[PDB]
Symmetry: D2
Subunit: 348 residues, 4 copies
């Protein structure tokens, strides 16, 4: 056609989501893990559970073998701490990036710019299935309208990226998702964008999306009431009590329950992975001191601490992030016990 | 699919391109206007790009009446201005409101999006066939597949300037793209978007066949900033120099488009005329960085609420025709001065 | 997969053709009225003959519109004895290598511009129906019919597919009457079976208007009939018509018949369609009422010609089967109308 | 429009290929058997192609036990016979009746086509993966995309041999294709079908993605006739000579596949044993133009009718009657001894 596809170099074939769902169907145990975890988070968001939702795991996944080793370790802590914590593993397959660089396992699983995205969807769905089947709920992030269709049935909770909290199509996506959804404050600390996203997400919408058959269609949503805010810092951290008090009043003024998930990382740690433990110390003191509004937290965590560069061409160390730096496993075990001990103190 | 109440059939883009193909005239209108904006953006034309038109389209009849008026002014001032009609089919907002001609053309909450796409693509076709190039707004990644072959220039929504999927959209679009600065006035987000949209990308998208696919884009060098104001207006000569310094440090061409409306006009539509005045003086004074402007105009001035008048915005207030005739000549005279 | 698959190319979905070329109110009225008219004839509440007459297949839309304009004048003049519908075929089934028709290769040069062919086919078919002239088609596969069937007032199943299950299933979902041809041999059983099968509802795999494969459920087509087209020797005489009318009554199916004046009934000789027209008119004049329809291969200029690629073709002349010219065509239709006015 | 009651979603072929992908053994099994039949059709191997197995499959369990037994004989007789198991998933009929495993896997008119496709592709996979090649029947244009990659040989439905679209389908298939003589015993439609299938074609079809496309095929040279009888059997030496001359007169190799059942057996399953003896006599006395045979064979001989709310005999055909295992073993040894005696 005329005036068409000048900046399009190549269109290639994408497996429809039904192909991935048929190849990797939920087991009964995987469907049970998803169903129970969703209901558990719903119960927390409705104020009928005094436990803390904990979304913890690698910035994103690059190696399914390290990821499954991580998942086994976190699952054991999930079983031991389940009276205090609802633990859900961060299983992200995309790292949003303004600059050039690896976009994540789905876009480029081979980490060599071969962009084998069908491979990446097979790898990602298989891993999510394996983790759920083991008993460990999974948390994802929704950056687009096409990718979630491949994985959403195995997600117990998801986040909308801070760079898309204001995006109408991402708010509409949320309003048709089957899992709970967290919306982050704006990259400058602004609360109102996230509150508007929750109100928009709770409403029905009619909009254009893609089906499980890989076809575009008109979709009508019912609205999603299981949405909440994620405090992730602005120019300065916003995890402290003063900020929690402001957000609580702000939600209540908007008619929303005063409830918050606090991201320990990103701008709340000033992108310094060890300060997640300093954020943890303060949030725990808030929780132990009686703060009911804090219903969840987020932590970037891996088997080995820190990060490493894909671009150097050095062989990758095992179990170490190639994107944001994470706390290692020993900090991760201590952090989770701190949280469980703060939830118990909140109670007694 | 607990929160999915209903799925309904959507015509693939290839059906609206087949029903409403570009005329040779509409295609030349698109080709020449894109090339012209490219030349302006490459620093090889001293002409000013003027994107001007209704806040949002609601009445195709009134849209065509306005297009005919603007076409004459476009013919008359073509030595100074590359005039392009603002053809936006929705006003992005946060709560209730008519979602626009595409989402609800029958203005009854029926959401006849297939009808809406027909009506919107026909309108875009008619306007391009008459000779008037069109500017659009790209809010999602599926709608542009139906309309973008008829667009000479596009703006990414202010609320999606920061979104990776919308920067990747821009990277594969066949027209120039404007990115608005942040709500606080800062320009880092738009600089990042321009840089993002300028690189090749591989991502998932829907083709003209209505099927999802893996898409590889080339990158889009014809991107630029749009100054729409932050808490304070950012149209003044001091603000332009500051942005031009910021652009230069980022290795980006020191060029800007100034939106006269919204916050740069203090929400007062008639005040867009005061921005013309300041902007015109800057141009007549020699300022070569201002390569474009954006103005909200209709046949009748102001706004109205669906809770009747012809040619009047049912959304944001717009200047009327007399002020639009005067504003366009004011800019063309300013370009003549700077040219000397 | 695909060692014998050389290339795959994109294909417009039917919704794209239906959206580009929507039925006018006139074409829709033409289609509706003609379908009602053929149903009444097939039920028995009308004595006029159904006449499906036109080129073997279309290769030149301009020539096809001149033919249609001429035929429309005669349809209006013989409308009280004849329900005239134009043969607008866009495929010629062939065993040997060669041209398969307009949709497959409209530029007749083995460029296979099938998206072009479908636009051309549907534009032509719509223009004919808007004029007021109803149209008859042939259904050779499950995919092509979706682009055209809303503009067909009647359809035939290829004689080489009359016992094919998918084709009987296709016929059970079409919105138009359908005709089933006897076998190469005079065997009429394969056609009776096909008529029963198409009257039944079925469930099978087909392609939608969106260009996607789907599971489809039909309701059954009762506006289906036989089409006698000869075999080893012709089979249009009231002797053969008797044999068939007895086998139809035997099988609970109306003893109605459509007679094809060409192909093996004409012994593959175009001019001999005039002879066949005589025997069939004699029976209709001799009171016989089973004959509800006929088929004729008819163009502007009689005969046929061999296609050479890049070579200009003679005007009005079929490049497939030989056809009778317009002069014989105007006479054959007046012969058939006289025969009906006699029937009364 | 007016006569369409319901449209339901159909899994695209890529969903079945992703769920049931060829393992390495299955692709090897298919690749070797395709090459071995091609070599046989080209006259570079004196071994006899034997397609043998149930009229159609209604029970994957019985099908796999049969595959196991047949696989053991494929190994033992490989030097004389290329044994391919008949894996059909429908008994074509204009009458009333079970429409096969893909249309109706649960044998109750539930028409669970997506389930049938899963069951049919999984069974075919399991058989090929064990090392036994499979033969298919092509009745429509849509179904083969789900299965053809696991078929080493196919036959076109007898009621579709003169269909252009089925001849075009064959021109694009990756396996050899058998074409059945006409119901009157005429071999003309089979010769026309063989010629048409050998030519490249351009035609509309559905892709692995469940979308209609324009397809161009290269042409299939590995096509041959299936002699299955007419109003009288056509397996005798007089008939073979008659067809061998009709194929030479047409420029096609003088080679035939003899179907032992249906009209060639007078609709009596045990009379397949008598066709076998005659065909063995021809071969053992130097007949080289018989390159393949087709036998309807199950674990347990005969057939039975499907009843609602009632169990079925195990291993027995619910469609056409088959010879059972004991005759099947004897038949295959007879054919193998006939190749030894011809060499
Ligand atoms: Cl990892
Ligand atoms: Cl308007
Ligand atoms: Cl013609
Ligand atoms: Cl079985």
């Amino acid at each position: 056609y005329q005036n068409d596809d000048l900046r399009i170099k190549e269109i290639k074939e994408l497996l429809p989501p039904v192909a991935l769902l048929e190849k990797f169907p939920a087991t009964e145990n995987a469907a049970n893990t998803v169903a129970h975890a969703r209901k558990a988070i719903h119960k927390i968001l409705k104020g009928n559970d005094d436990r803390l939702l904990v979304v913890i795991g690698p910035c994103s996944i690059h190696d399914p073998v390290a990821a499954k080793e991580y998942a086994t370790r976190l699952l054991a802590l999930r079983e031991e701490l389940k009276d205090e914590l609802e633990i859900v593993m961060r299983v992200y397959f995309e790292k949003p990036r303004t600059t050039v660089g690896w976009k994540g396992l789905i876009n480029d699983p081979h980490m060599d710019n071969s962009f084998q995205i069908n491979d990446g969807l097979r790898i990602a769905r298989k891993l999510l299935l394996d983790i759920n089947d083991s008993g460990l709920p999974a948390a994802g992030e929704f950056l687009d309208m096409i990718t979630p269709q491949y994985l959403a049935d195995l997600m117990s909770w998801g986040a909308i990226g801070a760079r898309t909290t204001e995006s109408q199509v991402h708010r509409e996506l949320a309003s048709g998702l089957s899992c709970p959804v967290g919306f982050k404050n704006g990259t400058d600390g602004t609360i109102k964008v996230a509150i508007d996203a929750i109100n928009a997400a709770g409403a029905p919408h009619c909009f254009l999306s893609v089906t499980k058959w890989g076809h575009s269609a008109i979709v009508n949503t019912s609205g999603n009431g299981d949405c909440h805010i994620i405090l992730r810092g602005g120019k300065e951290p916003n995890y402290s009590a003063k900020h929690v008090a402001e957000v609580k009043e702000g939600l209540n003024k908007a008619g929303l329950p005063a409830q918050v998930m606090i991201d320990f990382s990103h701008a709340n740690s000033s992108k310094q992975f060890k300060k997640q433990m300093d954020v943890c110390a303060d949030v725990c003191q808030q929780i132990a001191g009686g703060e009911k509004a804090i219903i969840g937290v987020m932590v970037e965590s891996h088997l080995v601490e820190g990060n490493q560069s894909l671009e150097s061409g050095e062989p990758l160390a095992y179990g170490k992030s190639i994107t944001d730096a994470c706390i290692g496993w020993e900090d991760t075990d201590a952090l989770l016990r701190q949280l469980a001990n703060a939830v118990k103190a909140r109670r007694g």
